[PDB]
Amino acid sequence: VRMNVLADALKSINNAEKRGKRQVLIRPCSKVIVRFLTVMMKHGYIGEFEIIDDHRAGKIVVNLTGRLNKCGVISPRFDVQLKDLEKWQNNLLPSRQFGFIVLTTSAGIMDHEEARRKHTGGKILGFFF
Partner 1 sequence: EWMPVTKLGRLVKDMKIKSLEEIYLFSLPIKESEIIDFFLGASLKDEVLKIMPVQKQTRAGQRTRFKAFVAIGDYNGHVGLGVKCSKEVATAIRGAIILAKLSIVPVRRGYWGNKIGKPHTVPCKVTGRCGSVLVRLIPAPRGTGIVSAPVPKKLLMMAGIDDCYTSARGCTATLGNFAKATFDAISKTYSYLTPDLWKETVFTKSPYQEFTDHLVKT
Partner 2 sequence: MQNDAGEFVDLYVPRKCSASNRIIGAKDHASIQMNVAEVDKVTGRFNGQFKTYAICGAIRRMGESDDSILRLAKADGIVSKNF
Partner RNA sequence: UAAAGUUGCUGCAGUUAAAAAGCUCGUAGUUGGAUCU
Partner RNA sequence: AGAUACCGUCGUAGUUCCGACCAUAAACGAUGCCGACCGGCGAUGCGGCGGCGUUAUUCCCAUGACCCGCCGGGCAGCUUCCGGGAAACCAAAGUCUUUGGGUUCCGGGGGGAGUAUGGUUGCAAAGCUGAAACUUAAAGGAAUUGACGGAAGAGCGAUUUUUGUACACACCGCCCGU
Contacts with RNA by CB under 7 A lie at 1-5, 7-8, 11-12, 14-16, 18-19, 28-32, 56-58, 69-70, 72-76, 91-92, 94
Q: How far apart are CA 12 and CA 34, in angstroms?
A: 15
How far apart are CB 81 and RNA at their closest, in Å? Answer: 15
Task: With H, G, I as helix, E, B as strand and everything else as coil, classify residue 10.
Answer: helix
By CB under 8 A, name the binding residues for partner 2.
20, 65-67
Residue 29 sits at the vertex; the CA angle it makes with 24 and 30, to the nearest 5 degrees, is 135
Sign of the torsion formed by the C-alpha atoms of 98, 102, 105 and 107: positive
Q: Phi, psi (5° rounding) for residue 11?
A: -65, -40
Contact flags string 80-119 toward partner 1, x per CB under 8 A: --------------xxxxx---------------------
Q: How far is the CB of 37 from partner 2 (least distance, A)?
A: 19
Give 44's DSSP letter: T
Q: Does 51 bind partner 1 (CB under 8 A)?
A: no
Query: Under the rule (CB under 8 A), what is the footprint of partner 1?
Result: 44, 66-67, 69, 94-98
